């Protein structure tokens, strides 16, 4: 019920860039066996979108870390807020695919 | 600066979020064609739920139309209008 999205607008907006992505903590820290987390996932700036070439892929060229207060839970025993670090993608580029 | 626990909780909790969706994934029958851009930005359910017994799902949907370059490789191209599904409202619901 909006107007039609114009081709150039879609092209520019979807082209390879850092986008807020909802990343599962256990995916980033797979060695955890002691705890479960609250929230179970975090919002992170990560490379997303398209390169419109088969010989290209969307990759990070500048990275940093972000610290978040996460509830660390030992099921049926206890809980405490801890500080957890995560990787963020600051700059993205379409680069020749890893053959 | 450290992101405060309540801020992370509210921001990651299950909701419609702009997601970069591959066109061929939404239209798997258009094998012969290639699209420019190859993907589109769509409001889709994302994020997490309270626990493992719950899943994040759409409870209100709509459509969006976008001008997409439709390409027949080595033959021709033209801008066409393509429709896509959007998720307007999300809920944490007991797993299927």
């Amino acid at each position, epitope marked *: 019920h909006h107007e039609v999205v114009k081709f150039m607008d879609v092209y520019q907006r979807s082209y390879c860039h850092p986008i807020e992505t909802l990343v599962d903590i256990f995916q980033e820290y797979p060695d955890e066996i002691e705890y479960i987390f609250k929230p179970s996932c975090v919002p992170l700036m990560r490379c997303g979108g398209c390169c419109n070439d088969e010989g290209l892929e969307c990759v990070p060229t500048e990275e940093s870390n972000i610290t978040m207060q996460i509830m660390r839970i030992k099921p049926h025993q*206890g*809980q405490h807020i801890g500080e957890m670090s995560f990787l963020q993608h600051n700059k993205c580029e379409c680069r020749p695919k890893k053959d | 600066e450290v992101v405060k626990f309540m801020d992370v909780y509210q921001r990651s909790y299950c909701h419609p979020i702009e997601t970069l969706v591959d066109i061929f994934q939404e239209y798997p029958d258009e094998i012969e064609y290639i699209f420019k851009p190859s993907c589109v930005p769509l409001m889709r359910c994302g994020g997490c739920c309270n626990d493992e017994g719950l899943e994040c799902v759409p409870t209100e949907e709509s459509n969006i139309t976008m001008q997409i370059m439709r390409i027949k490789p080595h033959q021709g191209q033209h801008i066409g209008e393509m429709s896509f599904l959007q998720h307007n409202k999300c809920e944490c619901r007991p797993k299927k």
Partner: antibody, heavy 120, light 109 residues
Framework: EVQLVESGGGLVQPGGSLRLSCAASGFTISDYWIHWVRQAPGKGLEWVAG????????YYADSVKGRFTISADTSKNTAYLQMNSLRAEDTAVYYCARFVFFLPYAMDYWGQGTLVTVSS | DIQMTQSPSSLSASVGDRVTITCRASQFLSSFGVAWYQQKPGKAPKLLIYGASSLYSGVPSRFSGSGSGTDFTLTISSLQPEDFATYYC?????????FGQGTKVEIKR
């Protein structure tokens, strides 16, 4: 020993304001969500206020929605329930309870309770 | 607002008796958002069962909880004089969090 200790109750004139304090000890109040539960004389338990798991924001009972506000002082390890525009139906024993995740969505430790009397 | 309806509203049984309180939900609830509490007169409630079937540490073994979907139950396998109290069920997942009406347990001697 984990303890929740309430204070700030007593007699209030109709249309008055009152602030209930919930003092934690044996734990850090920032590691949990403090919920408020009330019991009107002779009546059952009524859930009043608290940060909720489905979304993460502060919900209130329809009767108290718009006149009640919860808050916390992290340095004082204390939660508060500010009750304004008080009415007869708010006459009850008010409890504060520790809403927990490790025993999912349960209140394991409760305050002793405090009676609020809305009377002229 | 999900409604929690307990049955019976108030019962009465003998010491040694097996008694069961029922809590009926107005809609389907995943059995991990359901809690059972015991309340002695003029005293703060005490947690008995969490996640419909998990017995809280230090609570006597006679207490057990069960159910799924809309029907949840609390069983006292061997009723004791100290078991005189009002029992409440509570749903803590969906907003607003809500308590049942209560079931008064009285002892018969």
């Amino acid at each position: 020993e984990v303890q929740l200790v309430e204070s700030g109750g007593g007699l209030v004139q109709p249309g008055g304001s009152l602030r209930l304090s919930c003092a934690a000890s044996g734990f850090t109040i920032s590691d949990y969500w403090i919920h408020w539960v009330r019991q009107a004389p002779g009546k059952g338990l009524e859930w009043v206020a608290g940060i909720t798991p489905a979304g993460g924001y502060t919900y209130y009972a329809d009767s108290v929605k718009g006149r009640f506000t919860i808050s916390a002082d992290t340095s004082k390890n204390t939660a508060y329930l500010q009750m304004n525009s008080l009415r007869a139906e708010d006459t009850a024993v008010y409890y504060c309870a520790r809403f927990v995740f490790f025993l999912p969505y349960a209140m394991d430790y409760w305050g002793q309770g405090t009676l609020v009397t809305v009377s002229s | 607002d999900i409604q929690m309806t307990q049955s019976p509203s108030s019962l009465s049984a003998s010491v040694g008796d097996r008694v069961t309180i029922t809590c009926r939900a107005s809609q389907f609830l995943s059995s991990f958002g359901v809690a059972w509490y015991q309340q002695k007169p003029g005293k703060a409630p005490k947690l008995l069962i969490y996640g419909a079937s998990s017995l809280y540490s230090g609570v006597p073994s006679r207490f057990s909880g069960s159910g799924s979907g809309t029907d949840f139950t609390l069983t006292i396998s061997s009723l004791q004089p100290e078991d005189f109290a009002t029992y409440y069920c509570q749903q803590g997942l969906l907003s607003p969090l809500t308590f049942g009406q209560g079931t008064k347990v009285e002892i018969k001697r």
